Amino acid sequence: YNSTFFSTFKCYGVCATKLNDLCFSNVYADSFVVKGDDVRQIAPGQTGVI
Amino acid sequence: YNSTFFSTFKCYGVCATKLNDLCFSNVYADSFVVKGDDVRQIAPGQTGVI
Ligand SMILES: CCCCC/C=C\C/C=C\CCCCCCCC(=O)O
Ligand SMILES: *[C@@H]1O[C@H](CO)[C@@H](O)[C@H](O)[C@H]1NC(C)=O
Ligand SMILES: *[C@@H]1O[C@H](CO)[C@@H](O)[C@H](O)[C@H]1NC(C)=O
Numbered sequence: 001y002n003s004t005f006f007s008t009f010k011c012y013g014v015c016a017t018k019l020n021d022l023c024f025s026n027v028y029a030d031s032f033v034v035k036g037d038d039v040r041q042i043a044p045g046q047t048g049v050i
Numbered sequence: 051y052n053s054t055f056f057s058t059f060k061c062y063g064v065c066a067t068k069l070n071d072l073c074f075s076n077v078y079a080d081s082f083v084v085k086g087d088d089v090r091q092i093a094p095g096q097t098g099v100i
């Protein structure tokens with residue numbers, strides 16, 4: 001909350017407000033770089049080049 | 051996918067991922083120009099000047 005800010009943050013399967021009350025089993029992080037118009041394509045049930 | 055890119059693309063009545071498996075009956079295309087803040091108004095159940 002002091003340094004880093006996100007333009008988009010969207011969660012699926014769980015309300016965000018409960019993220020501090022849970023514990024997570026098999027955590028993986030995927031990283032890549034896209035353009036601004038392709039960020040909407042990173043979602044379930046989407047079409048496009050990405 | 052080589053030349054043209056869209057800032058918004060939203061479909062109603064069908065998942066986008068099935069658009070290649072179907073065939074369409076009465077296809078019409080409407081064209082116009084708006085400002086950036088009015089693009090959110092082109093949707094069902096919306097209010098505003100547009
Ligand atoms: C110009 C005539 C088009 C007629 C097609 C009629 C029905 C087909 C339905 C949808 C086609 C979507 C075309 C654009 C897809 C953009 C994909 C993307 O990059 O996000
Ligand atoms: C937040 O960042 C500022 C500037 O770098 C720093 O002075 C401050 O100590 C930070 N706060 C915490 C709690 O680390
Ligand atoms: C990221 O790392 C670089 C170098 O390690 C540092 O200069 C920068 O301040 C860091 N940014 C944040 C938000 O911590």
Ligand SMILES: *[C@@H]1O[C@H](CO)[C@@H](O)[C@H](O)[C@H]1NC(C)=O
Pocket residue numbers: 052
């Ligand atoms: C994509 O565009 C580039 C640049 O115009 C062109 O050289 C290339 O042949 C195009 N690809 C296809 C499959 O048409």
Ligand SMILES: *[C@@H]1O[C@H](CO)[C@@H](O)[C@H](O)[C@H]1NC(C)=O
Pocket residue numbers: 053054
């Ligand atoms: C659109 O048409 C113009 C002229 O016909 C052409 O110069 C331009 O490259 C075309 N754009 C695309 C994305 O095909």
